[PDB]
Amino acid sequence: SKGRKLNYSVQDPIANYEAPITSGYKWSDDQIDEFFAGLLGQ
Amino acid sequence: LKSTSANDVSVYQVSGTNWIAKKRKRQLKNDLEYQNRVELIQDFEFSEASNKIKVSRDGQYCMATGTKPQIHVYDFANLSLKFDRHTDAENVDFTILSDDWTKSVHLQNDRSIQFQNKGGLHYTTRIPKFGRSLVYNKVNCDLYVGASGNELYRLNLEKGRFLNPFKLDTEGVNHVSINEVNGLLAAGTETNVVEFWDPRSRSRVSKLYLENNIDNRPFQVTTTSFRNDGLTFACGTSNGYSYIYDLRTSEPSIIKDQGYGFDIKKIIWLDNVGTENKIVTCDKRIAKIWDRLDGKAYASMEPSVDINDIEHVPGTGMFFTANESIPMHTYYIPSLGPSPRWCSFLDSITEE
Amino acid sequence: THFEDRFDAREHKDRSN
Amino acid sequence: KHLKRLAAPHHWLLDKLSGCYAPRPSAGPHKLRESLPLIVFLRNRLKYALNGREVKAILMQRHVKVDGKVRTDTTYPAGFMDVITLDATNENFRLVYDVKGRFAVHRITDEEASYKLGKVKKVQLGKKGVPYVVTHDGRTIRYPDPNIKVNDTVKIDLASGKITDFIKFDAGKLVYVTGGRNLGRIGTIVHKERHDGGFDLVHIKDSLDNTFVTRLNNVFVIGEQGKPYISLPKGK
Amino acid sequence: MKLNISYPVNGSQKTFEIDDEHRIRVFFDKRIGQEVDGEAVGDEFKGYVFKISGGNDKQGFPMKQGVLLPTRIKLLLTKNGERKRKSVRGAIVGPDLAVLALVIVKKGEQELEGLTDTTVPKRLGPKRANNIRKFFGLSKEDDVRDFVIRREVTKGEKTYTKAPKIQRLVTPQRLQRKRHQRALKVRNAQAQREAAAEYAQLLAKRLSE
Amino acid sequence: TVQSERAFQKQPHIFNNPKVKTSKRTKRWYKNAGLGFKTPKTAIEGSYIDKKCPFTGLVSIRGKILTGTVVSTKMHRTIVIRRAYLHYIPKYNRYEKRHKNVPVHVSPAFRVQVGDIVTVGQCRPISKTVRFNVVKVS
Amino acid sequence: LKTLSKFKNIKNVYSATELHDHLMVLLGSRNTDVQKLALDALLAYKNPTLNKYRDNLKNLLDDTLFKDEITTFLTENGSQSIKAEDEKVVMPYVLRIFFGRAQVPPTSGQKRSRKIAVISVLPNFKKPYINDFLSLASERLDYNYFFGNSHQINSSKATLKTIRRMTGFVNIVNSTLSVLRTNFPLHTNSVLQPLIYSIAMAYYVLDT
Amino acid sequence: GISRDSRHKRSATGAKRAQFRKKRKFELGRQPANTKIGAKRIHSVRTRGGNKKYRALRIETGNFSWASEGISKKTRIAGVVYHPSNNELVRTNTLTKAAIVQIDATPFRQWFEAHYGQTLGAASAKIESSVESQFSAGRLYACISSRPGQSGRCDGYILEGEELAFYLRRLTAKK
RNA sequence: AUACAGUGAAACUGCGAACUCAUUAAAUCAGUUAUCGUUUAUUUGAUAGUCAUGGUAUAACUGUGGUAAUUCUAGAGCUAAUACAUGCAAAUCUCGACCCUUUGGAAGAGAUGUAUUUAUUAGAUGAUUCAUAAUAACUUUUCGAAUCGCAUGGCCUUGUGCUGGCGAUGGUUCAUUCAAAUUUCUGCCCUAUCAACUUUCGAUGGUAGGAUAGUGGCCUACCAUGGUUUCAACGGGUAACGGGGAAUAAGGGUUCGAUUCCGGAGAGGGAGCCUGAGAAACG
C-alpha cells in the first residue's frame, strides 16, 4: 500500500536517467570469473 | 595558522570549531587575532550538524547534507555556497551520479529515495524497508540499497525499474561497497559475516567470517572499503577494529584497533596521494592514517566535536570531515601531498 | 429539526407598495 | 475594508441616498453586526453634525462621552445598553432596540445614566484565586456576589465598574431578547427547555399573551416582573 | 598603483602614486592585515610601518578580507537582510589593483608631508554625560553642564552658540517619574488589599446571614 | 486483554502508588457525560482503557445528540448506525424514505448488537470520518 | 589585579605564600570580576595540576557555561573530570569558587538562584571537602573568643555586619543541611560552635 | 513541502478527489525532529502568532521524576532501549515521547541515602525489589513524557510497578 | 536657551504596506452548528513589590580613493536612543499568649513573584485531567519601566530634603473585539446507449509517535480488516459566461431591471527559502 511491497513496474521519470558504460569493467571477463571462482580460497 | 600536535607530522585545521556565538563576536571584535581570519569557503556550515559530505569527481563541487534538512553545494571556483536545497527528511546516505553536482541520489530517513537534478528535485520513490547504505554501479546502471531486512534492494536506473533484490542469510546490512575493477559487491551484515556477490550472475560469490581474539563480545560489520587494485579490502567493525584482507586469501593481513571502542564509519585508501599505501579509519572520536603493510601510525585528526563523515580530496592533503558542530572541519596535511588547485595559497598561511 | 432563529430584513421592511 | 452602503445592517437605519460607502465599526466592546458607530449615531440619527469632518470635530471636542469615559474614535462601536452622554447639551441617551428590530435612543436622566445592565456571560476564578465575571460588553469585574451565575444580569456603576445589584435568571421575570427573528421583544419567560440535537430554548410570553421561543444566549433579563430597572420606550 | 595611506591618530590621509612596479612588488602576495615596513618601498618611507587594510580592483571591485585568492570571486554578501551574490576581489594583494589602502602604525624619522604633519579634529563632541565625564576626567562631584563643549557659529554680525543636549542626565523630572511609578505600584497593591478586604467581609456577611 | 498493544495502556495522569497497597485494584477516573446521561456501571468498574470513551476518556460530548439503529459492528471500537429520514421529492409528488449512515465510535463499556437503537453525541473528530460517540444504548 | 596577573614570575616574586592566600581570599570574594582576576593571578602562579584543569575553572566562573561545567566536573562516572591525585590540589579552588557563587545575594532570577544548584552539587563531593566548605563558611566569623570567655558576648564585637555574616552563614548551613540530610557532617568546631554563637548574638541583640 | 491537508485523501465513498487549491500556509508541516543523545542543540522555530517552538536535536541530560518519592532530578540519558512505535528508532537512539530510555541512577541514589538514611542495594524506607536491582547496575528505566521536538526538553518519569513489569517483559521478549 | 528648549533636511526608530488565464454538479456555494479541538497586530475591560541613573556600536556627517557604471564601492575620522547590550532585603498578612480595656496595643510563633516543561496533590459548566491553589524540579526562558511633555506641587527639614498632579509610549497574563482555520447537518441538471467503487498518494478502523496554532490516517510504524451502494454508489455529457429569493427590486415591463458570490491558478517558466497577528506574498 504505502510502498511496503516491491512494485516491479516502469516508473516514467526515472526511466533512462543515465546510460550504462558499454566498455565493461577494468578486468577481462574471463579473469573476473576466474578471480570470483578462486576468491577467498574456495 | 596553528597545527594540531602530531609527532613529526603537521596537521593543520583550516576551518573548524576552534549565546556562545554572541559572546564570541564580542570577543572577536576586540581580538586582533580573530580580526583577520581565514575562511576557505564562505558559509561552509550547517545550523546544527552535518550528516555526510562528498566531493564530486569533476573536482570543483562539494555536496554535503545536514540539519532544517538541507543539501549544500559548494563551488570551489567561487569559494562559496552555490545553493542550499531543503528536503522533507534527514539524509542517511547519498551518491553523485554525474561528474559534477547535477545528478544525485539521496536515501533519506523516511524509507525513501530522492533524485536531485540541477533544476530541482526530480523524483521520489520509497523502498519497502528502512535503508542504511547506498551504492551505485555504473555499467549495470544499478542502484543497491542495504535495508533493515535481508533483501538488498536493486533499482535499475536505465530501465527505470525495481529488480529482484539479493536475498541474504542474515537480516540487516550496514554498508554496501562495490569494487570498481572486479564489479564485486560486499555487504556488511549485522553479524560478523560479510557477504560477497557478483552483480552479473546475481549470485553469492562467497562469505567471509571475521574473528577477533582480543574481544569476545560479538560485533557488527559497519564499513566496507575497496582499493583500486581489486585485491585488498578493508572491514570496519564496531568494536573499534579495522581488518585488511587480500581477497584471494581468507585471513586478514593486518588488524588495527583504534582503542576507543566506537564503530568505524569510514575507511579510505589514499592511493591518489604521493605517499602511497596509507589508509584512513574514522571513529567519532578520531581519524587515523596508517600504513597498510606495517600498521605504523602516520597521522591522527581529532576534532573536539564528533565526526559523522570524512572525505578526502583526491591527490591532495585535505580532508573534509562532516561533524556534529556548526562548521565542518577541514584538515590539511602538507606531508601527504600538495594543496589543491582552488586553494593553492594556503601554503603561505601554513608557513605563517 | 433545526430552527434558524435569524432576523429577516425582508420580513421587517415594508412591502405594501 | 470598505463596507458598502447596501451592506450596512438594517439596525442602523441609514439613508441609502447618502453615500456609496457605509462606515465600518471599529474593534471594541460590541460585535460588528450589533454595533452602532458614533458617526452613524451623531450624523445620520441625531443630525447634530452634517458630515464626517465635523463628526470628527465633535469627537475631538469631547462632548460625546460613551459609558462615562471619553471616546475620540469616529467609528467607535456603541451597542446595546450603552449610555452616551453629550456634556454640552446635558442629554443622556441609552441605546435600546426597537420592536421592529432597529436601534433607537432613549432619553434618560442622570441617576439612570449612572448605571448600566450587563449580561454575565462568564463566571470564573482568576489568578490568585480572585473571582471575576465577564459581561456582554466585555467588562471583567473582580470580586462579584457569589450568587451570580451565567446568564444573570448585573447593574454596574459607570464611575467605579462595580456591581451594585443583580437579577437572577428565573421563570416569570421580564427579559428582553437580543437576537434572531424575535429581535427587539420585551416579555416575561414561560420557561426554559432543552432541545434534542440542539440548544437551550427559552419560551417567552408577551404582553398580548403570544408565545415566542428563542435561544438562551439571545435573552437579556432587564428586570423582574412589573419593575423594569431601566426606562423603556413608548409602545412596549 | 595608487597608495591610499591613512594615519588614524592625526586623522589626516593622503594618496600617493608610484609608477615604478619595482617598489610596489614588495606588497605582492600578502593579504589584508599583514604588516610591511616601508624601507623596501622607498628611502623616504624607511621607518614607516604600514598595515594593509583594503584595496580596490581596476574594475572598482573591493577587496574582501578572508578569501585566499588574487582573483575576483562571487560571494554571498549582506545587502546592508537577505544575502546577495556580488563580485569581490580577493584579500591577497596582486598586480591588478588600482588602489591599495595602507594604515600607518608607527611613524618613521623622516616626516611625510600632508598626513603626518597636519591634524584634523573630531567633528562631534560627546552627548552622554558619562562620556563627557570620561573625556574631561571629571569626579562625581563636578557637574558636566558647564563642561559641555560649546560650538560657535556666526550669522552676520550676531554670534550664536549651540550645545548638545545632555542625555542620560539626572533631572528632578526623572526623579519625579521614578517616584511616581513607585507610588503607583504601591497604590495598586493597597487597592488590591482593600478589594480582598471588602470581598472577605461580604462573604462573612453572607456566611452570618 | 487491556495491555494487548505494544505501548502501555494507562489512563493519563492517574498514579497508583506502589508503596501503599490499595483496596481498589487501580484508581479509575470517570466523568459525568452530561445531557442527563448516567455513567454506566461497566464504565465505573471496567478495566478497559479508552481515550475516546465519553465517560472514561478525554472526549467530551457537546453539539448534537442523535439516535440511530446499529447496522455493522465489524470494526474495532466503532459502529456504523443508519438513520432513516423521510424526504419529499416534488417531481414524484410523494414522500420517500432516505437513509444516512453515520460511523460512530463505541466505548467498550457498551455492548451493542446489530439492530439496537443507540443514542450518539457529537464530539471532536475521533478519526477521518468519525465525529460521533455513543452515550446511551437502548 | 590585572597587573598582578600580567606579572611574569609571581612565584619568583617575594611573599608568594601570603600573596597566594590573599588571592584565594579574593577568589572567595563575591564579585565575579574579582573572582575572574584572582583566577587569572592563580593561573599566573601556574601550578601544573591547576593548569591541567584550568579550562574547567574558567567555565565554572563563566555564568553561561556554569551548569554544564558543574555537572561534568561533579559527575565522576559521567566523565573523567578530576583525577584522584589531582583532586587534592584542585579541590580548594573549586570549594572557594562555589563559596563565592554561594555568597551571591538571593534574587528571583534563576541565574542568581543558581546558588541553590551550587549548594546541591555538594553531595557529589567527599566528606572532607564538605567540611572544608563549612570551614570556609564559618570563616570571617569569630567564635573562639566567645567560647573562651565563659560564653559571654562582647558588646564591642556586637555589630550589624556581624549579624549579616551570621545570617549568611546560617542560610548556607540550612541549604547544605537540606541537600545533605542524614549524610551531613557535623563537626563541633566547624559548624556547631558558630551556630550557637550566632544564636547567642541574636539573644544579646534582642535583649538590647 | 509538507502539508497536512485532506484534499489528497479519498472520500469515504471512495471517490477520487481532485485538487483545485494550492498548498496554503495554514496547512503547513515541518520536518521531524530526529533527536539523538548529544551536546544540547536547540533550534528555535517561529510559529503561528509569533510563538516559539524549541526543537531538541541533541539532548544529554533531562529531568526525571520519581513519583512514589515525589522528587525530580536532572540525570543524563544513556540510550533508548525500547520504543512502541519503531525499532529503528531504538537502533539509532532517537529520543521521542513515550520512549523507554536508560538514565543514570546517581542523583536518585544520593537522595536515597540522604533522606532515608539507609544504604541502598524502615518499612516506609523499603522500596521495590526491581528498582533496587536496577540501581545496582546504575541504569534506571524511564519513560519520556515530554515532546522533545515541540518543547525543547526531554522530561520523563521512572518506570515503577506494573508498567515497569510490562516494559521489562517486552525488553526480554525483544532481547 | 551660560545642558537642550523655536522650527526642523538627512538619518536612526516605530506602524502600515495580507490584471490575465483555465470550468468543478455533496465539489463549490448558501444556511446551520461546533472549537470542553485552535491562533491575535489592534480595540475594549481587567491585571505585576517578592540607581541623583550602566556599557557600547553605528547612521546621517567629515574626509582619501577605486570603477565605463548601477539604489556600486573600499580605507581612515565622528558622536545619540522608546536602537542594541547591562542592571538595582523591605513591606504586607494569619496565629497573635499576656496586658489592660473595650474598639485596642503587643511577648512571640509563622508565611510569602511570574513564565517554560513534566511528575505528583485538591471555582465554573448539562459535562472535563477546565479555571484556580499547591509539592519536587527543570530552562541555551522569559517578564517584573535606566523612557517622553505639560504643570512647579504640597510640606518644613529650608533641607536645595520630602514628594506633587495630568498625560504619552511600554510590558505580563486572561478576557473581549477583529479575523481565520477546521467542523456539523440541510438543500442544485441529464443519463444505466454508465453497476460495481475504495486498499492504484491509506482505502475503513485500533495503538503509539511525528507534525501543526490545534482535532484528525495529516503523516509514520505495528495491528486488524473494513468503508459506499441498483433506493444508481460510480461514470459520462452539461453551451457549469452558470446558478445562488445572493441581491435591491419590478412604486402598473407579464416575469423585467440593478447589485453581490462566480470556483481556481499565475504575475517570463520549474524548484528551494525568508518577513509578519495575518501570505506558502503582485515583495
CB–CB of B156/B141 below 8 Å?
A: yes
Residue H119 C-alpha cell reads as 544504604
Residue in the structure block whose three cell numbers are 578572508: E66
Report resolution (Å) to 1 decimal.
Answer: 3.0
Note the Cα D204 to chain centre separation in Å.
Answer: 20
Neighbours of chain G (3+ CB pairs under 8 A): B, H
How far does the CA of E194 sit from the C1' of I105, in Å?
23
Burial A7-36 (b: 16+ CB within 10 A, else e): eeeeeeebeebeeeeeeebebeeeebeebb
Q: Does C7 contact D100 at a Cβ distance shorter than 8 Å? A: no
CB–CB of F107/F50 below 8 Å?
A: yes
Q: Does E75 contact B39 at a Cβ distance shorter than 8 Å? A: no
Mind telling me how many Å the CA of E106 is from chain B's nearest CA? 17
The single-letter DSSP state of residue F37 is: B
Please check whether residue B209 touches G, CB under 8 A.
no
- Alpha-carbon span D116 to D79, nearest angstrom: 12
| CATH number of the domain residue D197 falls in | 2.30.30.30
Does D2 share its domain with D106? yes
**H/E/C letters for each residue in B122-152?**
EEEEECCCCEEEEEEECCCCEEEEEECCCCE
The single-letter DSSP state of residue G189 is: I
CB–CB of F43/F53 below 8 Å?
A: yes
For residue H167, the number of C-alpha atoms closer than 13 Å in the C-beta half-sphere is: 25
Residue B172 C-alpha cell reads as 540487516
Q: Where are the domains of chain E?
A: 1-121, 122-209
DSSP letter for each residue of B230-291 = SSEEEEEETTTEEEEEESSSSSEEEEEE-SS-PPP-EEEEE-SSSS-SEEEEE-SS-EEEEE
Comparing every residue's Cα with the C1' atom of nucleotide I208, the nearest one is H85
Q: Does H31 contact B306 at a Cβ distance shorter than 8 Å? A: no
CA angle E69, E71, E76 (to 5 degrees): 80
Q: Which chain C residue lies closest to D217 (C-alpha atoms)?
A: C5
Q: Which of B300, B328, B341 is nearest to B14 (CA)?
A: B328
- The terminus-to-terminus CA distance of chain H in angstroms comes to 39
Type and span of the H or E element at H40: none
- Alpha-carbon span H134 to H139, nearest angstrom: 6
Q: Does E73 contact B79 at a Cβ distance shorter than 8 Å? A: yes
How far does the CA of F10 sit from the C1' of I128, in Å?
18
Helix, strand, coil shares, percent, chain B, to 5: 5, 45, 50
CA angle E81, E83, E87 (to 5 degrees): 140
Total number of domains in chain D: 3
- Alpha-carbon span E108 to E46, nearest angstrom: 6
SS3 G98: helix
Does D88 share its domain with D120? no
Q: Which of A14, A26, A32 minimises the CB distance to B123?
A: A14
| CATH number of the domain residue F2 falls in | 2.40.50.1000
Total number of domains in chain F: 1
Chain C residues with CB inside 8 Å of D100's CB?
12
| CATH number of the domain residue D50 falls in | 3.10.290.10
D124 bridge partner residues? D132
| CATH number of the domain residue D120 falls in | 2.40.50.740
Q: Domain boundary at D126, D147, D166, which?
A: D166
- Alpha-carbon span H93 to B26, nearest angstrom: 37
CB–CB of A40/B182 below 8 Å?
A: no
The single-letter DSSP state of residue F25 is: S
Burial B113-148 (b: 16+ CB within 10 A, else e): bbbbeeeeeebbbebbbbbbbbbbbeebbbbbbbbb
Does D146 share its domain with D55? no
Please check whether residue D100 touches C, CB under 8 A.
yes
- Alpha-carbon span B189 to B238, nearest angstrom: 12
Chain F residues with CB inside 8 Å of D197's CB?
64-66
Q: Does D181 contact C4 at a Cβ distance shorter than 8 Å? A: yes
Does D2 share its domain with D73? yes
H57 bridge partner residues? none
Chain D residues with CB inside 8 Å of C5's CB?
179-182, 214-215, 218
Does D135 share its domain with D183? no
Question: Which backbone phi and psi does E181 adopt, to 5 degrees?
Answer: -65, -40
Residue H46 C-alpha cell reads as 517561529
Q: Which chain H residue lies closest to G117 (C-alpha atoms)?
A: H74
Q: Domain boundary at D111, D138, D155, which?
A: D111
E contact test, residue of B15, B31, B41, B42 with most E CBs within 10 A: B42
H contact test, residue of B20, B22, B130 with most H CBs within 10 A: B130
CB-neighbour burial class of residue G175 (10 A; exposed 0-12, middle 13-18, buried 19+): middle
What number of C-beta contacts closer than 8 Å exist between B and E? 38
- Alpha-carbon span H84 to H93, nearest angstrom: 13
Which of the nucleotides lies closest to H25 (Cα–C1')? I280
CB-neighbour burial class of residue H1 (10 A; exposed 0-12, middle 13-18, buried 19+): exposed
The angle that helices G127-138 and G84-102 make with each other, rounded to 10 degrees, is: 30
Does D124 share its domain with D148? yes
- Alpha-carbon span D125 to D140, nearest angstrom: 12
CB–CB of B190/B174 below 8 Å?
A: yes
Experimental method: cryo-EM
Q: How far is CA B101 from CA B83, B272, F28, in A?
A: 11, 22, 61
Domain that holds residue D141: 116-166
SS3 B185: strand
Q: How far is CA A11 from CA A15, B124, B135, D106, H151, in A?
A: 6, 10, 20, 77, 41
Residue in the structure block whose three cell numbers are 545536514: B66
Residue F8 C-alpha cell reads as 502501555
Q: Residue F117: left if φ>0, alpha if ψ -120 to 50, beta else—which one?
A: beta
Residues 53-82 of F with CB under 8 A from D: 64-66
Please check whether residue B348 touches E, CB under 8 A.
yes
Largest Cα span, chain D: 55
Chains F and G touch (3+ CB pairs under 8 A): no
Q: Does D179 contact C7 at a Cβ distance shorter than 8 Å? A: yes
State which fold the E122-209 domain adopts.
1.20.5
The single-letter DSSP state of residue H149 is: H
The single-letter DSSP state of residue B326 is: S
- Alpha-carbon span B204 to D173, nearest angstrom: 93
Q: Which of H68, H80, H134, H127 is nearest to H106 (CA)?
A: H134
